[PDB]
Design a protein around this motif. Structure first.
Motif, PDB file in Angstrom:
ATOM      1  N   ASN A 165      39.230  45.479  24.398  1.00  0.00           N
ATOM      2  CA  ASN A 165      39.869  44.463  25.221  1.00  0.00           C
ATOM      3  C   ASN A 165      39.214  44.244  26.580  1.00  0.00           C
ATOM      4  O   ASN A 165      39.784  43.521  27.405  1.00  0.00           O
ATOM      5  CB  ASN A 165      41.329  44.850  25.474  1.00  0.00           C
ATOM      6  CG  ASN A 165      42.101  45.043  24.210  1.00  0.00           C
ATOM      7  OD1 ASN A 165      42.444  44.072  23.542  1.00  0.00           O
ATOM      8  ND2 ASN A 165      42.389  46.293  23.865  1.00  0.00           N
ATOM      9  N   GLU A 201      40.510  50.296  19.786  1.00  0.00           N
ATOM     10  CA  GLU A 201      41.415  50.243  20.927  1.00  0.00           C
ATOM     11  C   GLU A 201      41.257  51.525  21.744  1.00  0.00           C
ATOM     12  O   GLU A 201      41.153  52.612  21.168  1.00  0.00           O
ATOM     13  CB  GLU A 201      42.867  50.150  20.475  1.00  0.00           C
ATOM     14  CG  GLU A 201      43.203  48.932  19.648  1.00  0.00           C
ATOM     15  CD  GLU A 201      43.389  47.695  20.476  1.00  0.00           C
ATOM     16  OE1 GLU A 201      43.077  47.713  21.689  1.00  0.00           O
ATOM     17  OE2 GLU A 201      43.861  46.696  19.915  1.00  0.00           O
ATOM     18  N   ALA A 244      36.719  42.444  27.625  1.00  0.00           N
ATOM     19  CA  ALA A 244      36.575  40.992  27.797  1.00  0.00           C
ATOM     20  C   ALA A 244      35.693  40.614  28.987  1.00  0.00           C
ATOM     21  O   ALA A 244      35.974  39.656  29.709  1.00  0.00           O
ATOM     22  CB  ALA A 244      37.937  40.305  27.849  1.00  0.00           C
ATOM     23  N   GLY A 284      43.741  40.860  27.461  1.00  0.00           N
ATOM     24  CA  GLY A 284      42.765  41.829  27.895  1.00  0.00           C
ATOM     25  C   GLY A 284      42.292  41.586  29.308  1.00  0.00           C
ATOM     26  O   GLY A 284      42.925  40.873  30.090  1.00  0.00           O
ATOM     27  N   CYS A 318      40.401  40.335  21.659  1.00  0.00           N
ATOM     28  CA  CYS A 318      41.477  41.260  21.993  1.00  0.00           C
ATOM     29  C   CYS A 318      42.358  41.445  20.767  1.00  0.00           C
ATOM     30  O   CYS A 318      41.849  41.572  19.643  1.00  0.00           O
ATOM     31  CB  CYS A 318      42.210  40.817  23.264  1.00  0.00           C
ATOM     32  SG  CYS A 318      41.083  40.664  24.688  1.00  0.00           S
ATOM     33  N   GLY A 373      46.770  38.027  21.726  1.00  0.00           N
ATOM     34  CA  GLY A 373      45.914  39.053  22.291  1.00  0.00           C
ATOM     35  C   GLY A 373      45.829  38.890  23.791  1.00  0.00           C
ATOM     36  O   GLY A 373      46.020  37.793  24.324  1.00  0.00           O
TER      37      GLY A 373
END
Ligand code: CL
Length: 259
Positions: free
Chosen positions: A143, A139, A145, A211, A42, A209
């Motif tokens: 993110n 971006e 994940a 996410g 992230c 970070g």
């Protein structure tokens, strides 16, 4: 042994998957927990993107002053600084600071684009000797994940070693290294994460970070009072897609490995 048991207990209580790597430069030792597993980086990937721009600037003296247009079409999901500059320009220095200190994701995308995209950021990591880091996407999609997905991941061991090179080692020239450290020390997003698990007197430069899957991360360079510096990576992710943030887990891990 006791530190390992305490981290395992923290992980179990948290319900998720915890990755830790501490490098103690006093004695060149490491504390490792799931440190070779992959975790979605992230926002912590913005350190590598900013460092790639800093490296490029070593052979281009006007680079950090170069102007970048900010447009409505650049806005993504979290734009705390860039939203104030729409229809004007920001310098690459300003974008680096916004990415690192406010987690501005337009700023991240401008750093990525400047150097040639995610594969160029990844090639920079490889040039440094980091053969684990991979930045796949821009971006905001970097993110997501998703468990089991290797995109936009690294391991705690690799990230700690690379962060040590960038902040304390020789990856960057002296001016550029100092600039990265100053930017990270000025971060505004980390007070509830690693910093929250350390004494108030210690000095920290960090990048957080967050996410999907409740992913909650922090990477830091730490100057304990009257001690050699530390590098600490704490990565955390959870089983549920919509899990909530758990910055407290990162603080707890930091306390365990530095006590
Ligand atoms: Cl859920």
């Amino acid at each position: 042994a006791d530190v390992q048991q305490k981290l395992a207990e923290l992980e179990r209580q948290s319900g998720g998957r915890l990755g830790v790597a501490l490098i103690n430069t006093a004695d060149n030792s490491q504390i490792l927990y799931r440190a070779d597993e992959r975790f979605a980086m992230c926002x912590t990937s913005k350190v590598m993107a900013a460092a790639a721009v800093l490296k490029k600037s070593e052979s281009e003296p006007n680079l950090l002053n170069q102007r970048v247009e900010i447009k409505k079409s650049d806005l993504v999901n979290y734009n705390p600084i860039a939203e104030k500059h729409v229809n004007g320009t920001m310098s690459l220095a300003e974008l680096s600071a916004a990415a690192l200190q406010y987690s501005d994701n337009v700023a991240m995308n401008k750093l990525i684009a400047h150097v040639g995209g995610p594969a160029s950021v990844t090639a920079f990591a490889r040039q440094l000797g980091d053969e684990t880091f991979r930045l796949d996407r821009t971006e905001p999609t970097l993110n997501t994940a998703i468990p089991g997905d290797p995109r936009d991941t690294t391991s705690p061991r690799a990230m700690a070693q690379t962060l040590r090179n960038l902040t304390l080692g020789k990856a960057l020239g002296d001016s550029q290294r100092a600039q990265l450290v100053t930017w990270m020390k000025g971060n505004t997003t980390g007070a509830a994460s690693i910093q929250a698990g350390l004494p108030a007197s210690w000095v920290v430069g960090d990048k957080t970070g967050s996410g999907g899957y409740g992913t909650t991360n922090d990477i830091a360079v730490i100057w304990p009072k009257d001690r050699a510096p530390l590098i600490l990576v704490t990565y955390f992710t959870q089983p549920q897609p919509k899990a909530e943030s758990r910055r407290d887990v990162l603080a707890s891990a930091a306390k365990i490995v530095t006590d």
